[PDB]
Design a protein around this ligand. Sequence first.
Ligand SMILES: O=CCCCC[C@@H]1SC[C@@H]2NC(=O)N[C@@H]21
Lengths: 566, 678
Amino acid sequence: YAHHPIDYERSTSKSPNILRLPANTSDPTYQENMARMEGLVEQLRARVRYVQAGGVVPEEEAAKAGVSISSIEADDRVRKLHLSRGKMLARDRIERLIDPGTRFLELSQLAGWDLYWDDKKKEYERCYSGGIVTGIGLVNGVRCMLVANDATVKGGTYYPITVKKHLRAQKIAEQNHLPCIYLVDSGGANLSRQDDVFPDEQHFGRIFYNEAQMSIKSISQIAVVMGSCTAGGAYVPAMADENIIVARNGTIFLGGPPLVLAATGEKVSSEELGGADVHCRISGVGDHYATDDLHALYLARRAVANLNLKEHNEARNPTDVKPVPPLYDPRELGGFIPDMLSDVVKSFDVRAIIARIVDGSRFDEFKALYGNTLVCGFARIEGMQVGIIANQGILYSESALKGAHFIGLCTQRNVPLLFLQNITGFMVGKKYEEGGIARNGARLVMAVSSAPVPKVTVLIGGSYGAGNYGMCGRAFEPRFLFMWPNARISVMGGTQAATVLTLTNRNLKNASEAEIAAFKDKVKKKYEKEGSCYYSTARLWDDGVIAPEDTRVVVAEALRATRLAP
Amino acid sequence: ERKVEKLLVANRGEIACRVFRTCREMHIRTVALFCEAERNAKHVAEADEAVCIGPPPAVNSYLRGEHIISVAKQLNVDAIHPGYGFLSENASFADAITRSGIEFIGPPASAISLMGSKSESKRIMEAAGVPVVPGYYGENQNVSFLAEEAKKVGFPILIKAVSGGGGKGMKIVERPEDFTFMLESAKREATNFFKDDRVILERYVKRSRHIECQIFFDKHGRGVFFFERDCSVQRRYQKVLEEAPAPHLSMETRQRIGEVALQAAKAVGYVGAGTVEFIFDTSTGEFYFMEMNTRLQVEHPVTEEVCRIKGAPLDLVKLQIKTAMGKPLTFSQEDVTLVGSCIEARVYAESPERGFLPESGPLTFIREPFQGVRGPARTRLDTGFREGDNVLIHYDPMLAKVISWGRSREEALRGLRQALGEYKVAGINTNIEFLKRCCETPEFARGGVTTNFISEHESQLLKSPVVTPEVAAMAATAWLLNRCDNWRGAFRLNSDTNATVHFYIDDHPVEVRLHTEGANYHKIFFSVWDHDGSFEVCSGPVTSKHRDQKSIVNDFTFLFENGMHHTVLAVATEGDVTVIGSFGLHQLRLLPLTDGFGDSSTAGGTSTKIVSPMPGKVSKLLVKSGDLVEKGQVLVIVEAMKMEHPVRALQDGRVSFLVKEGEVVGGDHVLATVAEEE
Ligand SMILES: O=CCCCC[C@@H]1SC[C@@H]2NC(=O)N[C@@H]21
């Protein structure tokens, strides 16, 4: 009918239905939300600074961070003493190591935030980081995993949060075939929590297991020995394609200098006990002997160069690309996010978020009239086709079917998946249970777990209960996890668990007010005591923590990380 | 005197580049000024340093005179030239510049303030003794007073009224000895137009032609008037085309125009360059003062072509800097002699077919006319824009000025014709076609045109060439090829190719069909408006693969069967196809075909809309009943165990509520009927 184009015009124009046009009006509601978000990011963006240069914050105005006041002078004294030795006490080794003008990720940050409670009731162990810093680094045109042991040995070298971080880094590198670089500085072991860190599985032995399984798959790895690595820490220099020992302060020992005493205590110099022995000794241990920190870093870079990965990365990830920005300003991402601590769940939207994040502000909807709860479709993220699952409302059987169908197509055509978690939302109606809802949930989870597609999840907010099993979860092998500040990970019910557990717990009929004070308030305190900031990341649950505004850059880092894969 | 090494400019545009250029010859520094962005503009690429001033609105930019003065003081500027517009006429700014110690370029603040009010200015000229036609004498105290001064103060009778342009009291009563009709006319004018009963009488002129002499003065009491000018042609008080040598003007008169002009400028006191404007009636043969401007005009380079001083080319801006230098002149009024004739025309980025409304858009391709000497004529073009620039809506629409100096008027007018034709711009409609129409058919080559000359010939003008069916053929072909490989590598079986283009010419859709026979991409045909023919087409190099807003600009060749051949540079986009060639310029709008492609739902939506589940308890409805809902806002929010679960209906049309907040409703209830707006 008076309409005869050739699909384009209708396409390739600034007027295709594919795009999205949710324009906000900045009203009170927007302000209430936008403002809060701002109230939810300032310190997130801040604590980072405090742990960075940990314990030395000369401004002394860090009231925006709820961190307790710490003895700045002690940390400054320790840093001065350490830097007088001739080694750089910072993450400086990293940004010296990575090529200028390139990107970085800082995979796990704020690790071990106020984790352990000391004997002093008001004092926690001052683990500003997990004892290491981990991030994806691009060296000499080669993408690599960077792990650096921090010089914080006051509490002890490695904790249940340190070895877990190291093992997570090793698993990520092995999955993605990114070579690792380890910067080694250790105080040995922790002889206090040794039962928690040494024996059992997924412990310090699995590091040695991984450093051999990698070299089986011919994924070369490199370690730099800046200081002592004793107590089983001396095997990494031994198990290494290339290793670096600094001329003066680089030391490797299987038995400590105190250990020779009380067992043939003919004590001699710490150099002769296994440290950097530049005298043409009989031992052929340690590939590189470098006179200075810069010399060692330079030789590490030079060894990284001769791996032939530059051609493969350059072919797989195009270095010269034209950035395509979204149609709407990314600062608006905080506004559509609702507020917090609201008796009844507030309202929420997804279209706006996806239209703000994706390229050209576009989307490819599958069936949206049907199973209106769940959202699935294709997209574009900086030159790469992506699939997104974002959740909105209370799940039905049909939503599970649609999810299974989408995941089937994505696995069929080798399209990566992105997850945006939300509430559990399993209806409890009797008719729904009689309609085989459990079978359809199984249909969804089977497809989720069976998918060989790389998978990344990011918390939008309100991910509580067994609903994440429908979409995705840490136990379903997501190659990366990141989080927004307004996140709560809890039991099958965030608010309802309060009501349900109020009924069935040794309660007399009378004393109703005192009981709800003792029951409902207490369970609310329990189920929102956990949050994005503490229960997560600090314990390497969903290790990555980010800002809602800069999500697309992070996801693009992740996707470039997962295309060197076999 | 005071040395000058730094020059400051206020305004932007053609004047900025002009002031900047001569500056190079005097070997003086330059400074540029620009609004938000506006940094790719040419003038800033011509100066030595440029400073951003602030927000686009003229209140925010180029009007903060105090901020400009403070910035100039920080730069230790020697001189400032305001130019025309913005702070061109503001005595406070000039006084502040004088207090700061910078040599202001132009008249003193006293002259500007005095000429700001028309009443005090005309008072000054009346005291000076210059023939001035006033606007009023007293009031209508007595009806016999009208007969008393009718033959006294002004024999020509201008009855009119105190105000209002109706003027039915005039009756065009040019006959003196009128006493029974003038009073009746005035009394019938007073009816339904009472206003104030005071009536003013003046001289009435049948014809009007505008004259404006130029003048120059140092600060050491010495000056010399430049040659006269004509501004008869103007539409809606906007200058269109002007001539420095007023054709049909006796030499003796020229001389006298000067003596009158110098008297007025001396009386008020004046320094620098300026222009006195007159009003003239051929029938009376006398000139009467109308207004003067204490500011450099835009028409300065025009009068220059008809005046030489000591046999050397004259530069008007040069002297103004030398006047600011404090040096005295070197020539009397005599050293200046006229030589030949010249004409000028202004091009405006407006649409003649429309209500002369300015348009803003990127400049795709700008042809530049030959700005060199040849034959018996000199032709020049001055433009304040170049390729890749974009017109700003805040500024006035002004592209370039074209001037044709010659030894005789004929040569000058003829020269322009060809030049006006040659200059070409693609991207925005212009009035260039209008100006050429103003030059060909109107027999104003004689030289006699009145102030209202444009008004009567409006029927004759506003006319453009008819788009021949052939023009569609080249225009249609370019859009395909300048977009894709249509007709390139095409192939079918036992058949022949076909591809069609729809043009929305005027308010009627136009269809053109193109097809081939044989194995030839070369042999092509056409059928538009039931007219069929054949031609061949050979393209050029392929350019602009990115096909951005500028899209593709390529030359084309078309050999039609009859025998002709053509060359066409086509910058085609989805919105339109522009073809430039010996035919001229024509842009053909492509039939628009867009209408929410997808969301095209005419469903009635009678019932069972935004139904809520069993728990119900609707509340906090934020939509007004009977208001259009095309975007999917939250029509109703129902709560089921803390489940807001907003429905978010996207059905277009107004929504009618049958429920109220706080009312518990049953499962799948008809909360509202979302129906098409009827
Ligand atoms: O419309 C009313 C039914 C609401 C079901 C909400 C589901 S049931 C299990 C889970 N726990 C909650 O509190 N909400 C979800």
